[PDB]
Amino acid sequence: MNVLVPGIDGMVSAGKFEYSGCCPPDFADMDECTLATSYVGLLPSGPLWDRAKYEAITTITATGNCAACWTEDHCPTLVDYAVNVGARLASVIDMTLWPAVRESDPFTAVTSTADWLERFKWVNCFETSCRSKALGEITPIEYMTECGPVYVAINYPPSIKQAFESALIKSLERLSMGIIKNLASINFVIEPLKVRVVPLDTTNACENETLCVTFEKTSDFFDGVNQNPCGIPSPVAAYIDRDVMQLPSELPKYIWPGHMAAECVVRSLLSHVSRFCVVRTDQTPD
């Protein structure tokens, strides 16, 4: 039979089409060098233009940005200006139009990750001092004090914050499509965060007094976000070291922002179940 693959509707069978080849060129094919020399064709033709148009030469300087190469016997003409216009459009598109499209989709946003979260009205349940009592005696980012527990707000580095926010957006986008709250679907929703749910009970269950679940790490690296239209993203670490950040010693040695975010999502999803329990277990990088 077929081999099922995870999907928003559960386990389904996947496939592929045959290549068509009718795709318009993307931003990737937009090369500065080819585009610049191209406008030499927009000029007229005649004895005043043939020689100038024939000797057009273009080279890439230090930081890309193809520029015309003036040899020892260059003859100034409008053709130089035409090439200059070519460089302009290649540059302006990259600076102006590419970011607009790049930031328009939750699965490719880079610079506006924080803004996107505000569109989803996302609020973390581990930072409010009046958190729900069911969230455990002491959360991973709380240290006990005589006047009850107290939490500490972490200032993540730039790269880890960008990766974590990007992963959160992807999962939230998937959940807005509606799902059936079963184990197979939930794992797929939160898989970008690199977390997997796993029940503790292995027998029949359905009669015991409590149902317990725990969260396991599927990997020790978020998948970063790539600015350029071509190339793979750069992975970044998902954990944070307590000592390196100079945080109170009472906190756990390693802190996983992804696991905390995933825990909040699942807890809200399965609130209607009256015997749902979470038993978090300490995890360390390999």
Binding site: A28, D29, D31, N228, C230, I232
Partner: peptide, 10 residues
């Protein structure tokens, strides 16, 4: 090789 919409096998 280089940037291409038809993704070059990296």
């Amino acid at each position: 090789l280089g940037s291409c919409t038809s993704v070059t096998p990296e």
